[PDB]
Design a protein around this ligand. Structure first.
Ligand SMILES: [Mg+2]
Ligand SMILES: [Mg+2]
Length: 294
C-alpha cells in the first residue's frame, strides 16, 4: 500500500500532485534529518515539473476547530513545541512535495530519494522501533488567498509556485484532517469550496481600514484574514473512506482560533462538517523549510 511506487504513481494526471508524508523524528536524529531534507530538496528543486517543497513542524493543536467553548481558545497553541522543549515528544514533521502533473511526479524518483536519505532516520533509540510514516499522494482540489479563488489546473499550479509560508515570516499553518464517506465525497466537494469564499472575504473588525482585520488575541474576537487556503484530497480512497486536508496558512494561532468563532464561518462550515465521519483534527505547524523551483 505504498502510493509512491512507479505503479501507484502510474495509476493516477493533468493537475498538481503532492507527495505527502507525516513523520516522527527523535532528537538524536534531528540534525541528520534536516540535513537529509536539505540534500533531498536540492535534488528535487532542479527536476522538471517541481513546484515547491514545504517541511512543517507540528507546533500545537486547534481547540476552536472542535467548537469547544471560547474559554478553551488556543490552550494547545504551542503544546507540541513544549513537548520538544520537555523531551516528552519527538519532533513531528510533515512534508509536502508539489509537482506540476503526474508525469513530473512519476519522473522525480521520490521514493528512491526517500529510501536513501530519509527512511533510515525514522527510527527511535535503543537502534529502536521504526516510527512509521503516513504517506499519501494528494490532489489540490481548489485553492485561494485574500484576493482570489484558484479553480483551474494552471491557476492552482501558479498558486503552489508562490507559497506564502516563508519560514522567516513565522506564519502558522493549519491542517484540518477529516474523512468523508467515499460514496459522498463527490457531492461534498462543492460544499467545501464555499470555505474558500469565507477565507477570502472574512475578517474582524469588518471595517478595519487596511482590509485585512486586526490581530487576534486570547481576549478578543478579532482576526486578520487567512493568508492562503488549499483543499487537498487523497488521490486514493481508503476503502469506504476518502481523506482530506484543509490546508490553511495564517499570521497567528489567534487569528485562526478567532476565525472559527465568526458566525459567517460557523454558518458555512456546518454543512461541510456534517459529512465528516472521522475528524476534524486540526493541528498548528511552523514552516521550517520552503523550497521553490530553480
Ligand atoms: Mg528547473
Ligand atoms: Mg480551522
Amino acid at each position: 500500500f505504498n502510493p509512491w511506487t512507479d505503479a501507484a504513481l502510474d495509476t493516477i494526471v493533468n493537475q498538481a500532485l503532492t507527495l505527502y508524508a507525516e513523520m516522527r523524528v527523535v532528537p538524536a536524529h534531528h540534525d541528520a534529518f534536516l540535513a537529509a531534507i536539505d540534500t533531498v530538496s536540492a535534488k528535487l528543486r532542479v527536476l522538471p515539473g517541481f513546484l515547491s517543497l514545504a517541511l512543517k513542524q507540528m507546533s500545537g493543536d486547534s481547540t476552536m476547530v472542535k467548537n469547544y467553548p471560547e474559554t478553551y481558545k488556543g490552550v494547545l497553541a504551542t503544546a507540541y513545541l513544549d513537548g520538544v522543549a520537555a523531551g516528552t515528544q519527538p519532533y513531528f514533521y510533515n512534508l509536502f512535495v508539489r509537482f506540476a502533473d503526474g508525469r513530473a511526479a512519476r519522473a522525480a524518483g521520490f521514493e528512491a530519494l526517500f529510501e536513501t536519505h530519509i527512511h533510515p532516520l525514522l527510527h527511535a533509540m535503543a537502534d529502536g522501533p521504526e516510527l512509521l510514516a503516513y504517506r499519501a499522494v494528494l490532489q489540490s482540489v481548489v485553492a485561494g488567498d485574500r484576493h482570489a479563488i484558484y479553480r483551474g489546473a494552471e491557476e492552482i499550479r501558479s498558486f503552489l509556485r508562490r507559497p506564502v509560508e516563508l519560514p522567516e515570516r513565522e506564519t502558522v499553518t493549519v491542517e484540518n484532517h477529516v474523512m468523508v464517506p467515499e460514496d459522498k465525497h463527490a457531492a461534498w466537494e462543492p460544499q467545501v469550496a464555499i470555505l474558500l469564499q469565507v477565507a477570502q472575504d472574512t475578517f474582524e473588525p469588518q471595517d478595519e481600514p487596511s482590509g485585512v482585520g486586526l490581530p487576534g488575541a486570547r481576549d478578543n474576537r478579532y482576526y486578520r484574514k487567512a493568508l492562503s487556503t488549499e483543499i487537498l484530497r487523497n488521490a486514493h480512497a481508503d476503502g469506504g473512506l476518502r481523506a482530506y486536508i484543509m490546508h490553511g496558512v495564517w499570521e497567528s494561532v489567534w487569528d485562526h482560533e478567532n476565525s472559527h468563532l465568526d458566525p459567517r464561518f460557523l454558518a458555512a462550515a456546518g454543512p461541510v462538517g456534517a459529512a465528516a465521519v472521522v475528524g476534524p483534527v486540526e493541528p498548528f505547524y511552523l514552516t521550517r523549510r520552503l523550497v521553490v523551483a530553480d
